[PDB]
Amino acid sequence: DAELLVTVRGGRLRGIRLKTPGGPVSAFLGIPFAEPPMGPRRFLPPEPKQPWSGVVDATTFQSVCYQYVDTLYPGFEGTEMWNPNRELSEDCLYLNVWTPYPRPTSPTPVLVWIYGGGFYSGASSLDVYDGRFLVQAERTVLVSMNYRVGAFGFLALPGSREAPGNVGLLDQRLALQWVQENVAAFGGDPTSVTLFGESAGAASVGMHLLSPPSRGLFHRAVLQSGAPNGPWATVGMGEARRRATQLAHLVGCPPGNDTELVACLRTRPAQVLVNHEWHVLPQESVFRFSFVPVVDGDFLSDTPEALINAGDFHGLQVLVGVVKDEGSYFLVYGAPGFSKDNESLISRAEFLAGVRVGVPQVSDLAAEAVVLHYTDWLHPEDPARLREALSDVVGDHNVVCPVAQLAGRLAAQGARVYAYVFEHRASTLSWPLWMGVPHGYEIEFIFGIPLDPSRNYTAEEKIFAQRLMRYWANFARTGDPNEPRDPKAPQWPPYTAGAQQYVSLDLRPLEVRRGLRAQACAFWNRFLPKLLSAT
Amino acid sequence: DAELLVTVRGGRLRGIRLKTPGGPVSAFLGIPFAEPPMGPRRFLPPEPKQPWSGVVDATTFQSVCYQYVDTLYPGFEGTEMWNPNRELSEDCLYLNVWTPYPRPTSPTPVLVWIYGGGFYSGASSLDVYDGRFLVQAERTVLVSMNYRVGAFGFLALPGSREAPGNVGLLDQRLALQWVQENVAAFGGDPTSVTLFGESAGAASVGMHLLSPPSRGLFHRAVLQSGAPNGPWATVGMGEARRRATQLAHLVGCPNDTELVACLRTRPAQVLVNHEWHVLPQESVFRFSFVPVVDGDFLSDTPEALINAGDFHGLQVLVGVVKDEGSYFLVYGAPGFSKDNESLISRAEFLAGVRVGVPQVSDLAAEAVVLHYTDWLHPEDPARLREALSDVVGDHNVVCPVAQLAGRLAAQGARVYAYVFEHRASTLSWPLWMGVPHGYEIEFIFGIPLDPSRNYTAEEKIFAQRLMRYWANFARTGDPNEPRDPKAPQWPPYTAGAQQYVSLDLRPLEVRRGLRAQACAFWNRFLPKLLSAT
Numbered sequence A: 001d002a003e004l005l006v007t008v009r010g011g012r013l014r015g016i017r018l019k020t021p022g023g024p025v026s027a028f029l030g031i032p033f034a035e036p037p038m039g040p041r042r043f044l045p046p047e048p049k050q051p052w053s054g055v056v057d058a059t060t061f062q063s064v065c066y067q068y069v070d071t072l073y074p075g076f077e078g079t080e081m082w083n084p085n086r087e088l089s090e091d092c093l094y095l096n097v098w099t100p101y102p103r104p105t106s107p108t109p110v111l112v113w114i115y116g117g118g119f120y121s122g123a124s125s126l127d128v129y130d131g132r133f134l135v136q137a138e139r140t141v142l143v144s145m146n147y148r149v150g151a152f153g154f155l156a157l158p159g160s161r162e163a164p165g166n167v168g169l170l171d172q173r174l175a176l177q178w179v180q181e182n183v184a185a186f187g188g189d190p191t192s193v194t195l196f197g198e199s200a201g202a203a204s205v206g207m208h209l210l211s212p213p214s215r216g217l218f219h220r221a222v223l224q225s226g227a228p229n230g231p232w233a234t235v236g237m238g239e240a241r242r243r244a245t246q247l248a249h250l251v252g253c254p255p256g257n258d259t260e261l262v263a264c265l266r267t268r269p270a271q272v273l274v275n276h277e278w279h280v281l282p283q284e285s286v287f288r289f290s291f292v293p294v295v296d297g298d299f300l301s302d303t304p305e306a307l308i309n310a311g312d313f314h315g316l317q318v319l320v321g322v323v324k325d326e327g328s329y330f331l332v333y334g335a336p337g338f339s340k341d342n343e344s345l346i347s348r349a350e351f352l353a354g355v356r357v358g359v360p361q362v363s364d365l366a367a368e369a370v371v372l373h374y375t376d377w378l379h380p381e382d383p384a385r386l387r388e389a390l391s392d393v394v395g396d397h398n399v400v401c402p403v404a405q406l407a408g409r410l411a412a413q414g415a416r417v418y419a420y421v422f423e424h425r426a427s428t429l430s431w432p433l434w435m436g437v438p439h440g441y442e443i444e445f446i447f448g449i450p451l452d453p454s455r456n457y458t459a460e461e462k463i464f465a466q467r468l469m470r471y472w473a474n475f476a477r478t479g480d481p482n483e484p485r486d487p488k489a490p491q492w493p494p495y496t497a498g499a500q501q502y503v504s505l506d507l508r509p510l511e512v513r514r515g516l517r518a519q520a521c522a523f524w525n526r527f528l529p530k531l532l533s534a535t
Numbered sequence B: 001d002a003e004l005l006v007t008v009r010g011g012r013l014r015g016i017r018l019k020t021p022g023g024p025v026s027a028f029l030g031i032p033f034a035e036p037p038m039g040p041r042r043f044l045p046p047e048p049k050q051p052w053s054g055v056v057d058a059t060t061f062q063s064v065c066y067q068y069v070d071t072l073y074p075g076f077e078g079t080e081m082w083n084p085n086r087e088l089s090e091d092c093l094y095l096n097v098w099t100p101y102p103r104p105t106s107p108t109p110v111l112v113w114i115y116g117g118g119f120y121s122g123a124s125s126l127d128v129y130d131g132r133f134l135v136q137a138e139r140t141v142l143v144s145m146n147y148r149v150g151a152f153g154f155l156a157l158p159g160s161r162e163a164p165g166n167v168g169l170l171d172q173r174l175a176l177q178w179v180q181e182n183v184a185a186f187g188g189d190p191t192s193v194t195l196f197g198e199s200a201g202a203a204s205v206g207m208h209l210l211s212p213p214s215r216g217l218f219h220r221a222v223l224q225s226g227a228p229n230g231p232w233a234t235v236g237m238g239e240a241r242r243r244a245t246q247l248a249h250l251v252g253c254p255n256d257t258e259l260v261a262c263l264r265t266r267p268a269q270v271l272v273n274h275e276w277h278v279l280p281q282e283s284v285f286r287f288s289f290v291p292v293v294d295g296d297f298l299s300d301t302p303e304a305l306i307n308a309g310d311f312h313g314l315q316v317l318v319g320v321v322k323d324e325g326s327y328f329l330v331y332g333a334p335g336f337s338k339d340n341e342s343l344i345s346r347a348e349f350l351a352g353v354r355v356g357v358p359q360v361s362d363l364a365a366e367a368v369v370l371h372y373t374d375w376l377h378p379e380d381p382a383r384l385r386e387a388l389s390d391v392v393g394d395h396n397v398v399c400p401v402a403q404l405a406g407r408l409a410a411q412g413a414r415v416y417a418y419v420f421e422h423r424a425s426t427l428s429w430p431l432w433m434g435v436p437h438g439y440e441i442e443f444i445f446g447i448p449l450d451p452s453r454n455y456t457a458e459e460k461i462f463a464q465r466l467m468r469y470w471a472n473f474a475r476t477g478d479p480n481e482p483r484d485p486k487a488p489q490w491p492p493y494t495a496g497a498q499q500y501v502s503l504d505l506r507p508l509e510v511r512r513g514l515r516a517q518a519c520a521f522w523n524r525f526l527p528k529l530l531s532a533t
């Protein structure tokens, strides 16, 4: 096959033809887009890859950036599907290009995927991110990249030149630049690049909206279950510094006491850092991750809540959404009395405790605010309800309301915004019933995984996934997911700050609903901040 | 006939026969129970009436205690019905007694009614308190008395022998003492006396529950749409002196013995005409002269008493109407009136929140506003109207009543709760007000049975039912019929299950939680808010 030998600005590539049941797709895997960030380059922003001679074996996936590996449920499908699926290395700055089998003769739009995993984990090599199905069925180019996570991507000593912070975001930016110079080689259009990501990926997309040097590297944006204004997505310079120096003391970094500091971190082996990374966190918590983007004033000019309020958003098109049960997955990772194996029927006492790990580091009074605002004062002792109630607390505080805040403020300032709630449970789904439609289980449907001859998805689901892939494809093509000029009754209307319409994505045709937990998010976006400042 | 001549401890009375569609009834109206609290005895606790020669003309209602007479809607039934229907007088400490025409040979239980009216108005002679239908139908004895209101009842310079506070409450207690000693002359049993009262009447009942010297004059309590722990029913010592001292400056009065001496020199009418001028801000369910926490009557704040009280051996019947708030909005909330639809703007609504929960922080009022704003329809006027009607209803009546009920029940009382949900076919208020505060009273008293008032045949049955609930409770402390399992049962209210019944023309219906979710904000969070701010 001739379509498998392509040349980018840095040298020659050898690709691999992939099979799908609809027809083939040609793909390039593990293209090196940066110089490997190793030894003295650890913690330093990425440097573009020096051009090479020969051909690059771009036929398999490259390594996974060093990260924590979840040991909670050994060999359990639900946890393991996210665990690294390649070898770990700090040599991990590589990206992947899928493109329709006969390379499109006309410039087609490009979809860049950014994986999530709370900025401490994840990898473009994961099976649920296989782009062959999206690219085969909607003939668009797809690109995904690896980026440094955990300390390797976000340990920061604000103001140091040695751990400048946000190097994982620069990793992403570099890749987007690569897309600008090189996607034209694969039939893609550098003037039609649409970013999409889930969890911290969605937060990542968000900060690219809010950082000017990225704003000319794409044109549309899809944020799935994540937002840059999340309570978990950013950290102040003072905290960043404190957390970083803690890791150094926690790993033994003794006798300027700031450039000396990072050299010692630069000697410790990668695993030893990963080991002590979760101890750095301020208080016991869930949905909180040690090393995240810092608000330094370089990459993030101000807090995201500030940058959203007065941004440059007119003409932007944004697709935005959540799953139905955004909190339940995190509850088994810290809330007392929670397992995937029992019904998680907690007590009042356990519910109260879980509130203070769900909403960590707020005043005692603000904790009471939540506790009273989420109890069902008619059935306050009911374990079933207390469970689901804490699920709402965690889901609302971290995902739903920060996303809802983002949607209205963009729409206010003249972004064309479309919003969904994914509310369909995969028949395959391995997590227990009480977790509902959990964080991250819209992804496989967006990527058309139900078309895989291997897996055991349903007839009903095959068509559903094709419907989702079209929505996302229509979006990346045109800034509007709506089936272009369709008299068929379902019609997905844009999200305004007033009416606040969104669609329900499930096996039934789109329902148009008003208000993304409107009453609940009034508490979190409007009232709660007043408590926090005024007491 | 010789059944209308009765001799109580202090002399002879001559009463009157009242005709009822079901038979006649003997009444004794205007029985003096206290030496007239005049001249030097103004603001002083009542003195027991000394015995008299001859026979007292007990054949018509005595005078109404001096008070503000409402003139918001002059000539309108909805307001005139609460206004004085007798002459105003400081010579007003009388009581009334209804009793079955064949005077009961067996000692029969006593209902004692205490009227309401914000502790500033009211009279036992009002037509919706006519006791004749109760006794004729359920064959009980009904007693009502007047008690001083306004400054005459509750002006206090706490401490001073001269204006010690709460004499209106002591007025009530003295009349109960009269009941203990004299009810038996009319057929009544002094060992089954049930207190019931509405609005400030209900708060009074609550305060007798918490005042040890009163808690031997009755055995059961019925609180309708009011509670002693409400935000309007008591003031602090410092605040009450602050108000009494202002009224004295308003009226031209230059030391505390001095001050009260000068106030005693003023025509009663002159005081009345400055009463509202004394309140400390624009308000909509607040009154100038109310019970005070002196230490004598209430040995501590009403809430403090409830929390630490033991109530084993008490049965309490308790309830609210469907829309407690709507009535008070036309008395100062911006944009309301009985005569249009009262579709308020949002800004009208945010201003209404400040007058409806007055004297709380900015943050506090904010909290109220994001708890009562519907954030999918933040500017719908109709929704904004019913929100305000909830804000003042919940904060002033419902959540205080529910909070008292959970405590009494959890601490040894047997409690029964209702929500009154019927709108009289004759109601003169506009429709948006719903079931307004005070408009179950006619049904409790069986007024639909008066042939002249034009109620429904259905509506008459409804009132009989209610009367039987109330008599039954007075008789035995259980509103249910004893020999009727199959009758729709009214179960006791408890702190967890929180069951009440709905009184309307549908048969008993059981619901959970008296605005349980709303009331958590009021009874549980907002306190913690004003504390840590």
Ligand SMILES: *[C@@H]1O[C@H](CO[C@@H]2O[C@@H](C)[C@@H](O)[C@@H](O)[C@@H]2O)[C@@H](O[C@@H]2O[C@H](CO)[C@@H](O)[C@H](O)[C@H]2NC(C)=O)[C@H](O)[C@H]1NC(C)=O
Residues within 6 Å of the ligand: A335, A336, A337, A338, A339, A341, A342, A343, A344, A345
């Ligand atoms: C539901 O499960 C949790 C998890 O407890 C255990 O986790 C495994 C490691 C194993 O030991 C299993 O037996 C359990 O599923 C329960 O919470 C724990 O309960 C134990 C004793 O009851 C206690 O020592 C732990 O501290 C608890 N964990 C906390 C508080 O985070 C929970 O009680 C289970 N609910 C049931 C069985 O109804």
Ligand SMILES: *[C@@H]1O[C@H](CO[C@@H]2O[C@@H](C)[C@@H](O)[C@@H](O)[C@@H]2O)[C@@H](O[C@@H]2O[C@H](CO)[C@@H](O)[C@H](O)[C@H]2NC(C)=O)[C@H](O)[C@H]1NC(C)=O
Residues within 6 Å of the ligand: B332, B333, B334, B335, B336, B337, B339, B340, B341, B342, B343, B344
């Ligand atoms: C609804 O009515 C209120 C109250 O006004 C009374 O009833 C009206 C039918 C009208 O005839 C008024 O004169 C009555 O006094 C309206 O609010 C009033 O508006 C006037 C305008 O100058 C103002 O001076 C008053 O202070 C207002 N009253 C209050 C209590 O704020 C209101 O505008 C009417 N309309 C709506 C839509 O609510």
Ligand SMILES: CC(=O)N[C@H]1[C@H]([C@H](O)[C@H](O)CO)O[C@@](O[C@@H]2[C@@H](O)[C@H](O)O[C@H](CO)[C@@H]2O)(C(=O)O)C[C@@H]1O
Residues within 6 Å of the ligand: A045, A046, A047, A164, A170, A171, A173, A174, A213, A214, A298
């Ligand atoms: C050191 C730091 O905090 N930021 C860097 C960053 C890095 O060089 C990184 O490699 C970005 O991928 O780059 C910054 O400015 C850039 C230019 O150096 C580049 O030639 O063109 C870019 C166009 O998007 C961009 O303007 C940045 O992104 O802020 C600045 C700084 O050197």
Ligand SMILES: *[C@@H]1O[C@H](CO)[C@@H](O[C@@H]2O[C@H](CO)[C@@H](O)[C@H](O)[C@H]2NC(C)=O)[C@H](O)[C@H]1NC(C)=O
Residues within 6 Å of the ligand: B255, B256, B257, B258
């Ligand atoms: C306020 O001043 C009055 C004066 O009118 C004080 O009343 C005194 O009472 C005694 C009898 O106990 C009499 O001799 C006079 O009436 C008054 N004496 C004087 C010297 O004024 C009253 O005690 C004062 N009130 C206080 C201090 O609370």
Ligand SMILES: O=C(C[n+]1ccccc1)NNCc1cc(C(O)O)nc(-c2ccccc2)n1
Residues within 6 Å of the ligand: B070, B082, B116, B117, B118, B199, B276, B283, B284, B285, B286, B287, B328, B331, B332, B437, B438
């Ligand atoms: O309860 C009533 C009548 N009733 C009595 C018993 C049961 C049911 C109803 N009537 N309530 C008047 C009221 C309330 C308020 C408000 O402040 O509470 N204000 C005023 C007012 C009067 C003159 C000048 C200014 C204000 N009148």
Ligand SMILES: [Cl-]
Residues within 6 Å of the ligand: A030, A031, A032, A056
């Ligand atoms: Cl390579």
Ligand SMILES: [Cl-]
Residues within 6 Å of the ligand: A039, A040, A266
């Ligand atoms: Cl080094």
Ligand SMILES: [Cl-]
Residues within 6 Å of the ligand: A057
């Ligand atoms: Cl190799």
Ligand SMILES: [Cl-]
Residues within 6 Å of the ligand: A103, A104, A105, A106
């Ligand atoms: Cl083509």
Ligand SMILES: [Cl-]
Residues within 6 Å of the ligand: A215, A218, A219, A316
């Ligand atoms: Cl743009």
Ligand SMILES: [Cl-]
Residues within 6 Å of the ligand: A228, A229, A230, A303, A304, A305, A306
């Ligand atoms: Cl923020």
Ligand SMILES: [Cl-]
Residues within 6 Å of the ligand: A236, A237, A238, A239
């Ligand atoms: Cl800080």
Ligand SMILES: [Cl-]
Residues within 6 Å of the ligand: A236, A237, A238, A239
């Ligand atoms: Cl800071």
Ligand SMILES: [Cl-]
Residues within 6 Å of the ligand: A256, A257, A258, A259, A260
């Ligand atoms: Cl240094």
Ligand SMILES: [Cl-]
Residues within 6 Å of the ligand: A268, A269, A270, A271
């Ligand atoms: Cl290493």
Ligand SMILES: [Cl-]
Residues within 6 Å of the ligand: none
């Ligand atoms: Cl356009």
